[PDB]
């Protein structure tokens, strides 16, 4: 079937994943030869599972690498050098927009006035 | 370079044209010996630095914590008055005993009026060669004007 399970991929190490990737890349190339020289449809039907297995192997490797690198750059001393490809995307405007902390800043007089005359809860009978 | 040519040509144009007395008075500076004596007195009474002010306040805070009932004066040691706003208030309210004005302030409108203000209030004043030297005496890069409002008994004769 040449179907590799995602559960086993997530348990394999980096070197094992690279080894499996090479095997599936090799076997895919052998099937490309079969595609040229006719071949039985049963062999040709293996191309799609193998291509998707290669995608699964690459998905695991890239997901693991990105997660590990985000952990490494989560250090406070090193988070100013975080690659932009690993920073949060959001939106151009939202990255440049004032955060809540900066937008809520008040002057000392404003702070005192808010404390001196807070908004009250009331009712009329 | 263009900026080099312009700064030399600016000096030429300032000397060739007719300079009104308000601007011309800043070219008639105090003599070197008196200027050095004045800046020495200013350096002696220079304002305290960030560090020295900080330990003084911390010592006051510790004394306040040690004896909460007692009152500790936060007054800084006697020093010169620096900064355009504070010097101007000292001249207006007549606390300044002597005022020292730099002659190369640019824009000159900042201190162009000060000699007349000192004259109107009968405050002794002098015009000296460098705001940089004035800043050096007070521990800054530059200083437009510096006013002395009081000195210790040993420096009273010098003042």
């Amino acid at each position: 079937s040449h179907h590799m399970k995602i559960k086993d991929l997530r348990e394999k190490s980096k070197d094992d994943l690279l080894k499996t990737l090479t095997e599936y890349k090799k076997e895919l190339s052998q099937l490309r030869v079969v595609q040229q020289t006719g071949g039985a449809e049963t062999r040709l039907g293996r191309i799609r599972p193998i291509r998707k297995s290669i995608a699964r192997i690459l998905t695991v490797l890239n997901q693991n690498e990105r997660s590990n690198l985000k952990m490494f750059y989560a250090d406070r001393k090193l988070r100013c050098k975080t690659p932009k490809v690993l920073r949060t995307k959001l939106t151009h405007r939202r990255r440049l927009a004032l955060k809540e902390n900066e937008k809520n800043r008040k002057t000392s007089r404003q702070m005192r006035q808010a404390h001196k005359f807070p908004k009250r809860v009331y009712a009329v009978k | 370079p263009t900026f080099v040519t312009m700064q030399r040509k600016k000096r030429v144009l300032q000397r060739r044209l007719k300079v009104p007395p308000a601007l011309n008075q800043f070219t008639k500076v105090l003599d070197r010996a008196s200027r050095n004596e004045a800046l020495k007195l200013i350096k002696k009474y220079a304002p305290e630095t960030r560090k020295a002010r900080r330990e003084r306040l911390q010592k006051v805070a510790e004394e306040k914590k040690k004896d909460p009932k007692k009152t500790v004066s936060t007054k800084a040691p006697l020093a010169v008055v620096t900064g355009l706003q504070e010097v101007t208030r000292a001249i207006e309210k007549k606390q300044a005993r002597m005022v020292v004005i730099a002659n190369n302030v640019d824009p000159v409108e900042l201190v162009l009026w000060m000699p007349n203000l000192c004259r109107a209030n009968k405050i002794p004043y002098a015009i000296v060669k460098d705001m940089a030297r004035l800043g050096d005496a007070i521990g800054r890069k530059t200083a437009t004007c510096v006013a002395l409002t009081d000195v210790n008994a040993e420096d009273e004769a010098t003042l």
């Binding site: 008040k106 | 009104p20 308000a22 162009l112 009026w113 000060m114 203000l117």
Partner: protein, 203 residues
């Protein structure tokens, strides 16, 4: 304080000393670029009055604008249509030179936000304005409650929309009431209000 003496001194531009000072400065400005960055404002009292502060993130630029009336840019001064539109030299720009100087500075440096500007000097050929600019990405600006409003994206290129003090001047917003009823909230908005055909459902 010291502001008064500086403020009253600048009300005497025609005096001998102020004329000498402005002459030397006008000569120096003639030999500089159209747009020039300054470390400090030439008129600190005027700049501070208009919103400048001696803080990280505030910038001051001097902008040169050419004096005189606007010439209509038609080929060989040839106009068509009715003779009412045949003028070439005698028409005037509906914007003031201060707004033009602000728009010149703002368009050239898109990373800054234009706050205000003020007159500094002029000669027979040129008029000079100093424009106060604010960095919206500066930490000091962003955390200062007094200027951080300009960080918001609604204020991007406000000088290009005539929202500065000079822009308000030529729009007519200095006046209120019966002096500017047809100009408020804008002349186009007033035109929309007065010219749209209203169709009530039950008429």
């Amino acid at each position: 304080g010291a502001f008064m003496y500086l403020n009253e001194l600048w009300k005497k531009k025609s005096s001998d000393v102020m004329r000498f000072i402005q002459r030397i400065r006008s000569w120096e400005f003639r030999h500089q670029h159209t747009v020039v960055r300054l470390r400090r404002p030439t008129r600190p009292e005027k700049a501070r009055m208009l919103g400048y502060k001696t803080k990280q993130g505030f910038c001051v630029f001097r902008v040169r604008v050419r004096r005189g009336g606007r010439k209509r840019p038609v080929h060989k001064g040839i106009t068509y249509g009715k003779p009412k539109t045949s003028g070439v030299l005698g028409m005037k720009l509906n914007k003031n030179n201060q707004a033009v100087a602000e728009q010149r500075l703002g368009k050239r440096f898109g990373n800054l936000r234009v706050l205000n500007s003020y007159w500094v000097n002029m000669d027979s050929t040129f008029k000079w304005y100093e424009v106060i600019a604010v960095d919206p990405m500066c930490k000091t600006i962003r955390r200062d409650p007094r200027i951080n409003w300009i960080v918001n994206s609604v204020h991007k290129h406000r000088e290009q929309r005539g929202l500065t003090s000079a822009g308000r001047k030529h729009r007519g917003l200095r006046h209120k009431g019966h002096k500017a009823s047809k100009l408020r909230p804008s002349y186009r908005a007033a035109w929309r209000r007065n010219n749209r055909i209203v169709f009530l459902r039950k008429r």
